[PDB]
Design an enzyme around this catalytic site. Structure first.
Site, PDB file in Angstrom:
ATOM      1  CG  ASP A 427      -2.038   1.102   1.336  1.00 54.03           C
ATOM      2  OD1 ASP A 427      -2.466   1.428   0.336  1.00 54.03           O
ATOM      3  OD2 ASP A 427      -2.275   1.678   2.402  1.00 54.03           O
ATOM      4  CD  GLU A 430      -0.190   5.730  -3.679  1.00 50.79           C
ATOM      5  OE1 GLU A 430       0.018   5.844  -2.544  1.00 50.79           O
ATOM      6  OE2 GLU A 430      -1.139   4.629  -3.950  1.00 50.79           O
ATOM      7  CG  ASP A 525      -8.602   4.317   0.685  1.00 53.08           C
ATOM      8  OD1 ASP A 525      -8.444   2.998   0.538  1.00 53.08           O
ATOM      9  OD2 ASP A 525      -8.008   4.929   1.099  1.00 53.08           O
ATOM     10  CG  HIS A 583      -9.813  -4.023   2.849  1.00 52.52           C
ATOM     11  ND1 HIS A 583      -9.405  -4.157   4.153  1.00 52.52           N
ATOM     12  CD2 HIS A 583      -9.155  -2.644   2.563  1.00 52.52           C
ATOM     13  CE1 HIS A 583      -8.696  -3.086   4.654  1.00 52.52           C
ATOM     14  NE2 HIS A 583      -8.527  -2.214   3.613  1.00 52.52           N
TER      15      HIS A 583
HETATM   16  O1  LIG Z   1      -3.653   0.650   6.288  1.00 52.04           O
HETATM   17  C1  LIG Z   1      -4.745   1.418   6.628  1.00 52.04           C
HETATM   18  C2  LIG Z   1      -5.249   1.943   5.037  1.00 52.04           C
HETATM   19  O2  LIG Z   1      -4.392   2.316   4.206  1.00 52.04           O
HETATM   20  C3  LIG Z   1      -5.049   2.898   3.100  1.00 52.04           C
HETATM   21  O3  LIG Z   1      -5.929   3.866   3.193  1.00 52.04           O
HETATM   22  C4  LIG Z   1      -5.309   1.845   2.228  1.00 52.04           C
HETATM   23  O4  LIG Z   1      -5.835   2.386   1.098  1.00 52.04           O
HETATM   24  C5  LIG Z   1      -6.702   1.060   3.046  1.00 52.04           C
HETATM   25  O5  LIG Z   1      -7.273  -0.225   2.416  1.00 52.04           O
HETATM   26  C6  LIG Z   1      -6.087   0.508   4.264  1.00 52.04           C
HETATM   27  O6  LIG Z   1      -6.956   0.230   5.154  1.00 52.04           O
END
Ligand SMILES: OC[C@H]1O[C@H](O)[C@H](O)[C@@H](O)[C@@H]1O
Ligand SMILES: *[C@@H]1O[C@H](CO)[C@@H](O[C@@H]2O[C@H](CO)[C@@H](O[C@@H]3O[C@H](CO)[C@@H](O)[C@H](O)[C@@H]3O)[C@H](O)[C@H]2NC(C)=O)[C@H](O)[C@H]1NC(C)=O
Ligand SMILES: *[C@@H]1O[C@H](CO[C@H]2O[C@H](C)[C@H](O)[C@H](O)[C@H]2O)[C@@H](O[C@@H]2O[C@H](CO)[C@@H](O)[C@H](O)[C@H]2NC(C)=O)[C@H](O)[C@H]1NC(C)=O
Ligand SMILES: *[C@@H]1O[C@H](CO)[C@@H](O[C@@H]2O[C@H](CO)[C@@H](O)[C@H](O)[C@H]2NC(C)=O)[C@H](O)[C@H]1NC(C)=O
Ligand SMILES: *[C@@H]1O[C@H](CO)[C@@H](O[C@@H]2O[C@H](CO)[C@@H](O)[C@H](O)[C@H]2NC(C)=O)[C@H](O)[C@H]1NC(C)=O
Ligand SMILES: *[C@@H]1O[C@H](CO[C@H]2O[C@H](C)[C@H](O)[C@H](O)[C@H]2O)[C@@H](O)[C@H](O)[C@H]1NC(C)=O
Ligand SMILES: *[C@@H]1O[C@H](CO)[C@@H](O)[C@H](O)[C@H]1NC(C)=O
Ligand SMILES: OC[C@H]1O[C@@H](O)[C@H](O)[C@@H](O)[C@@H]1O
Ligand SMILES: OC[C@H]1O[C@H](O)[C@H](O)[C@@H](O)[C@@H]1O
EC number: 3.2.1.20
Length: 850
Positions: A427, A430, A525, A583
């Site tokens: 995650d 970017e 998200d 999720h």
């Molecule tokens: O790790 C906490 C969050 O980080 C980012 O917002 C991710 O896109 C999300 O899926 C995750 O729950």
């Protein structure tokens, strides 16, 4: 003026850099005409505006070379007045050209390299490249339509488009077909919850353009800089990049599926996932202990919901740090994952790229070792750039540094030695930063403040990320930003291969062109809304065309609170995402399948059961993606390009050639209207798995289908055979079950299909021949297999059921290998012949009836 008589739709903007007055427009040598109501440019180039001139065109063994010369400066600083053009006629389908500064090596995207259908000719002054499709003479590319700009931090190349129908240019929240009505599409990877008109997590500078009659071509600009792509309704397109070179590939098709395969021949065919990766995944932010996490599996199991892979989010970590686990709720983390494995399930967890930099020296090995080995992105004074993310202060690994790759492999292997996780959810890559640039801001220079800033959210390249002038091994972040995620995905892929010795499973937020060679993607998200449910269909289709077929959205939505009805419809549709994960955010109401009312649970269970039945087929579709650059989920227009009614359909999807899914995407509906291409389409609910029409006989038309809350419409195309397998709560269980065939006959009694089978997770399967491959053929009231390859992994596969659709007359007898079968049923109302057999996929059989 004479030269200012340019049709409105064909005006290209001569003030893309700033607000301009009429006097300033005219002093640039441009035309000033206000529109009568971005939009159409008021300040635009006459056909005589200075461009580059072609000189010394020469014909080489590979193609053409020439010099391009600009005599009059543009309004941008640092025009490169002398360029080199190289045109390479690489294959019959692929034309390649570059425009470079012959006096200076400029930044280039790192990439391994892989009568014609095209011809190519050149305009001399103003310079342009013209590409024709030879078969019909259609002009595919014509860069003569606007001036070539080539300045140190601004490249612009424009072309006419052959139609108003163009797709690609991810990642944005959009219909599959992009709007040509003065649309600015910005490629700059950005952590923002998907919203319209925004640069999102990924950047893919590729488009596929449809042509009247159903041919298509594609164009890939191999450039990783921040860019705008401007579509106007003439129709035409302008690439506007902030650095690098123009490195352009044209793919001639002519079929849209061929265009996609040709593109993937350059960027890489999709990686082959492990079979288990196609099972259901379940996650949330807030499973805050091993006990709670164990309860998820327990609750799914008790309510008969399949679950292959349990996930955790940040909860597992010690103070939100990579490669740790807290000693409170997660004290027994190793044992939890070991126990998951004992039951036949896998385990995934979140990994962020940024590394906590604030701990005492010697107390946090990932950082301490990173520092020692010089793995981090550095700033002006040579020190690690420090930002802020989940753990607090953090440094950012440079995944272009070979030493950082080795460090990442080491951190992954050492953590895997403690807790034997089965892949990585990467995650925040970017890369995302909760402050602008760094704790110390950023310097004032031309990389941080460039002469052309694309239409990025926040209006700066530093917004929600790191400084553009920070240093990486290969170049500055300015050039490499759009590759950050990709480079992490490559590093993680390699790390997992070395740590585990089997196929890697990496799911990444940020992506770039070529990502699919290493990893999958989820769309980030998304809100728990009907809008975002519907928008997930074009987005999943888009990523398939971009060679990232392992893609999906968070089932039932991530942000906010889902409703029961939404989560039923999202589970139904999301069971057809090639990557299926539910999720959920930290503060949201629970949305696991077992948390809903009984009728909702039944509908969700049915969705998951049907997915698991279809897994052999889905796996075979992934094999085709991996070996031939095919799509897994595909729009109707990819499969029926010559039917122009399909061109704007993106609320239906196909799996491969043959399975049409028509979801309900709105609250309160008990019906749905979908397009059915010419053909017979059998209702998949007539296949026995463990007024509704059994067959839709379509001429190419819209059809309204019943679709109550318990139903998603799924139809099987006549002429195709689909392999299925018996049920299980995991693929460990399901892969051991008997198989079946669903045989959809044409009117003339024909059908064809296939099965690919290997051990589900080993490396180098195809290279080593460790797979079974079988073709199925129905013809003249017989069904046979054809053995393409048969090996140990595949020789145990039991075929126990054959279901034949479109059997007009009840058989008097059904034979399996010449012997009357133990049992069959025929339904005169559905035209379904259902046959019990005791056969083997890997041994030749003949089933017949009359
Ligand atoms: O790790 C906490 C969050 O980080 C980012 O917002 C991710 O896109 C999300 O899926 C995750 O729950
Ligand atoms: C390049 O990155 C380094 C960090 O890797 C930056 O170092 C930071 O520099 C600032 C001052 O410029 C330091 O702030 C000072 O902190 C002390 C207390 O610790 C305080 O007494 C001072 O008044 C001041 O606030 C900061 O601590 C330091 N960060 C770290 C982690 O050491 C450096 O500034 C960056 N260079 C550029 C040009 O951005
Ligand atoms: C287009 O090409 C001509 C001819 O180039 C020749 O000379 C250069 C130096 C190379 O050796 C090349 O292989 C040869 O084909 C260029 O014109 C030449 O330029 C030279 C350097 O300025 C002059 O000294 C020379 O007199 C001149 N020759 C002729 C026949 O005119 C020309 O500059 C080039 N155009 C561009 C835009 O690069
Ligand atoms: C490529 O685009 C250019 C510019 O739009 C076209 O060139 C123009 O052609 C018209 C006649 O059709 C002439 O009157 C103009 O003088 C040309 N303009 C310039 C700037 O040269 C060209 O026809 C297009 N080529 C093809 C093959 O479609
Ligand atoms: C797993 O299911 C159990 C049983 O439904 C859940 O336990 C209940 O949790 C609620 C709190 O929301 C309590 O009001 C009940 O009294 C609990 N019942 C029992 C028998 O323990 C549990 O929350 C579920 N766990 C997860 C992680 O979904
Ligand atoms: C998501 O839900 C939580 C909790 O919501 C609580 O109150 C509402 C009115 C319902 O009755 C729920 O059943 C109950 O648990 C909210 O705190 C949260 O704000 C909400 N999120 C949004 C975006 O509205
Ligand atoms: C179908 O098979 C039967 C023999 O069982 C034969 O009479 C008939 O000609 C066959 N049809 C075709 C098209 O080959
Ligand atoms: O796009 C239209 C806009 O163009 C700008 O360059 C002008 O300064 C504005 O007055 C105008 O509204
Ligand atoms: O041509 C000057 C301006 O005209 C108008 C357009 O909306 C804008 O995009 C352009 O910059």
């Amino acid at each position: 003026p004479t030269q200012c008589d340019v049709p409105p739709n064909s005006r290209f903007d001569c003030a893309p850099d700033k607000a301009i007055t009429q006097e300033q427009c005219e002093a640039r040598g441009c035309c000033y005409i206000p529109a009568k109501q971005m939009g159409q440019p008021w300040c635009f180039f006459p056909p005589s505006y200075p461009s580059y001139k072609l000189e010394n065109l020469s014909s080489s063994e590979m193609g053409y070379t020439a010099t391009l010369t600009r005599t009059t400066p543009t309004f941008f600083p640092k025009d490169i007045l002398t360029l080199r053009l190289d045109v390479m006629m690489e294959t019959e389908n692929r034309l390649h050209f570059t425009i470079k500064d012959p006096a200076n090596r400029r930044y280039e995207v790192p990439l391994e390299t892989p009568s014609p259908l095209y011809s190519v000719e050149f305009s001399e002054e103003p310079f342009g490249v013209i590409v024709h499709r030879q078969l019909d003479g259609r002009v595919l590319l014509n860069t003569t339509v606007a001036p070539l700009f080539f300045a140190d931090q601004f490249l612009q190349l424009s072309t006419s488009l052959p139609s108003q129908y163009i797709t690609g240019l991810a990642e944005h929240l959009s219909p599959l077909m992009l709007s040509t009505s003065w649309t600015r599409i910005t490629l700059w990877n950005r952590d923002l919850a998907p919203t319209p008109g925004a640069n999102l997590y990924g950047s893919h500078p590729f488009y596929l353009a449809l042509e009247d009659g159903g041919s298509a071509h594609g164009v890939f600009l191999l450039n990783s800089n921040a860019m705008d792509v401007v579509l106007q309704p003439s129709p035409a397109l302008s690439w506007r990049s902030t650095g690098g070179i123009l490195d352009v590939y044209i793919f001639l098709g002519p079929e849209p599926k061929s265009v996609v395969q040709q593109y993937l021949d350059v960027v890489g065919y999709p990686f082959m996932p492990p079979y288990w990766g196609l099972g259901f995944h379940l996650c949330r932010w807030g499973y805050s202990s091993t006990a709670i996490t164990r309860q998820v599996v327990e609750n799914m199991t008790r309510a008969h919901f399949p679950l292959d892979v349990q996930w955790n989010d940040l909860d597992y970590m010690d103070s939100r740090r990579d490669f740790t686990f807290n000693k409170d709720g997660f004290r027994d983390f190793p044992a939890m994952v070991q126990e998951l494995h004992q039951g036949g399930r896998r385990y995934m967890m979140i990994v962020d790229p940024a590394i906590s930099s604030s701990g005492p020296a010697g107390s946090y090995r990932p950082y301490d070792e990173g520092l020692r080995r010089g793995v981090f992105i550095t700033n002006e004074t040579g020190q690690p750039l420090i930002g802020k993310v989940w753990p607090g202060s953090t440094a950012f690994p440079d995944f272009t540094n070979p030493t950082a790759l080795a460090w990442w492999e080491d951190m992954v292997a050492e953590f895997h030695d403690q807790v034997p996780f089965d892949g990585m959810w990467i995650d925040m890559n970017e890369p995302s930063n909760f402050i602008r640039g760094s704790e110390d801001g950023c310097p004032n220079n031309e990389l941080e403040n460039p002469p052309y800033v694309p239409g990025v959210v926040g209006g700066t390249l530093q917004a929600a990320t790191i400084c553009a002038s920070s240093h990486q091994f290969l170049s500055t972040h300015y050039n490499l930003h759009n590759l950050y995620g990709l480079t992490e995905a490559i590093a993680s892929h390699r790390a997992l291969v070395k740590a585990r010795g089997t196929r890697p499973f990496v799911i990444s937020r940020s992506t770039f062109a070529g990502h699919g060679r290493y990893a999958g993607h989820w769309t980030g998200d998304v809100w728990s809304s009907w809008e975002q449910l519907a928008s997930s269909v074009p987005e999943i289709l888009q990523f398939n065309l971009l060679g990232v077929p392992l893609v999906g959205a968070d089932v039932c939505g991530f942000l906010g609170n889902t409703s029961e009805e939404l989560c039923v419809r999202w589970t139904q549709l999301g069971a057809f995402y090639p990557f299926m994960r539910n999720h959920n955010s930290l503060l949201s109401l629970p949305q696991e399948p077992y948390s809903f009312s009984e009728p909702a649970q039944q509908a969700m269970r049915k969705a998951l059961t049907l997915r698991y039945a279809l897994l052999p087929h889905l796996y075979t579709l992934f094999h085709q993606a991996h070996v031939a650059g095919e799509t897994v989920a595909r729009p109707l227009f990819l499969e029926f390009p010559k039917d122009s009614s399909t061109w704007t359909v993106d609320h239906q999807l196909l799996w491969g050639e043959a399975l049409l899914i028509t979801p309900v995407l709105q609250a309160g509906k008990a019906e749905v209207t979908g397009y059915f291409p010419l053909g017979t389409w059998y209702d998949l609910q007539t296949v026995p798995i463990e007024p509704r029409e059994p067959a839709i006989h379509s001429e190419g038309q819209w059809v309204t289908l019943p679709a109550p809350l318990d139903t998603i419409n799924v139809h099987l195309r006549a002429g195709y055979i689909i392999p299925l397998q018996g049920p299980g709560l995991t693929t460990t269980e399901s892969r051991q079950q008997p198989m079946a065939l669903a045989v959809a006959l044409t009117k003339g009694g024909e059908a064809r299909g296939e099965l690919f089978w290997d051990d589900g997770e080993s490396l180098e399967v195809l290279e080593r021949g460790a797979y079974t491959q079988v073709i199925f053929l129905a013809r003249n009231n017989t069904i046979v297999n054809e053995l393409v390859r048969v090996t140990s992994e595949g020789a145990g596969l039991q075929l126990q059921k054959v279901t034949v659709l479109g059997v007009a007359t009840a058989p008097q007898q059904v034979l399996s290998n010449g012997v009357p079968v133990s049992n069959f049923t025929y339904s005169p109302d559905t035209k379904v012949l259902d046959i019990c057999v005791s056969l083997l996929m890997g041994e030749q059989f003949l089933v017949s009836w009359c």
